[PDB]
């Protein structure tokens, strides 16, 4: 039933990002991807910050993006044997990890002359994947709070921008986009 409420409340806000997500004339790709990645990170961060009091251990006993999909934490050298985590714990680990990635002067240079690493696009795509996992969990489990908090428009706009960017540069496979493809097909028209 979640799909039909999600597709009912798709209409949101009061423009076209599709031109704005495009790589500007003569702009380095890695820098663009980095900037938008950090931006989306902040967005999703405070977004989840709004409904964190609804997202408790009891409400979300396991990291779920709908009854069909269930995510497990891993893929970090520290804490490497996969753990069956709850919503707030998993999301905590995720956002903390991404935060540590963005704060790394090696992967995301702060100085001007410092160039990006060779494997930057990969970890960028990883980050974006996991951020989408957060998006999916919020959209599936804690959607009623978004409605009552009247944050529906802002959530849909943020997600729309995210999807426009990702699709613009093909940074997330559709297999990961699966839990929300029904919505993605609608927002991208």
């Amino acid at each position: 039933s979640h799909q039909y409420e999600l597709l009912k409340h798709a209409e949101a806000d009061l423009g076209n990002l599709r031109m704005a997500v495009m790589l500007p004339e003569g702009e380095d790709l890695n820098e663009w991807v980095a900037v938008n990645t950090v931006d989306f990170f902040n967005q999703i961060n405070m977004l989840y910050g709004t409904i964190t009091d609804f997202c408790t251990e009891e409400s979300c006993p396991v990291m779920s993006a709908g009854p069909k999909y269930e995510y497990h934490w891993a893929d970090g050298t520290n804490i490497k044997k996969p753990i069956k985590c709850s919503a707030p714990k998993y999301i905590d680990y995720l956002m903390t990890w991404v935060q540590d990635q963005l704060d790394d002067e090696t992967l995301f240079p702060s100085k001007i002359g410092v160039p990006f690493p060779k494997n930057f696009m990969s970890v960028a795509k990883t980050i974006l994947k996991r951020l989408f996992r957060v998006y999916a969990h919020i959209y599936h489990q804690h959607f009623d709070p978004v409605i009552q908090l009247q944050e529906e428009a802002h959530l849909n706009t943020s997600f729309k921008h995210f999807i426009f960017f990702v699709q613009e540069f093909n940074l997330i496979d559709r297999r990961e986009l699966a839990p929300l493809q029904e919505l993605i097909e609608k927002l991208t028209s």
Binding site: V35, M46, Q150, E151
Partner: protein, 71 residues
């Protein structure tokens, strides 16, 4: 760290307006530079140089914005 709803809503509206405006302004600087540079000049090498430094400045700006150098 939890945020209030009104804060988030404001952030999103302000952010969207900022993105669209910044994009529009970028395209505006590019077009403006092209028009004035075309108006009373000039070799093609010079255009390439000016465009290169401008693009470098833009990339630097978005890098600083990425580096949260606004505080």
């Amino acid at each position: 760290q939890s945020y209030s709803p009104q804060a988030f809503k404001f952030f999103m509206e302000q952010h969207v307006e900022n993105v669209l405006k910044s994009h529009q302004q970028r395209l505006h600087r590019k077009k403006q530079l092209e028009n004035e540079m075309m108006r009373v000049g000039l070799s093609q090498d010079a255009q390439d140089q000016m465009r290169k430094m401008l693009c470098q400045k833009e990339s630097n700006y978005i890098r600083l914005k990425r580096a949260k150098m606004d505080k």
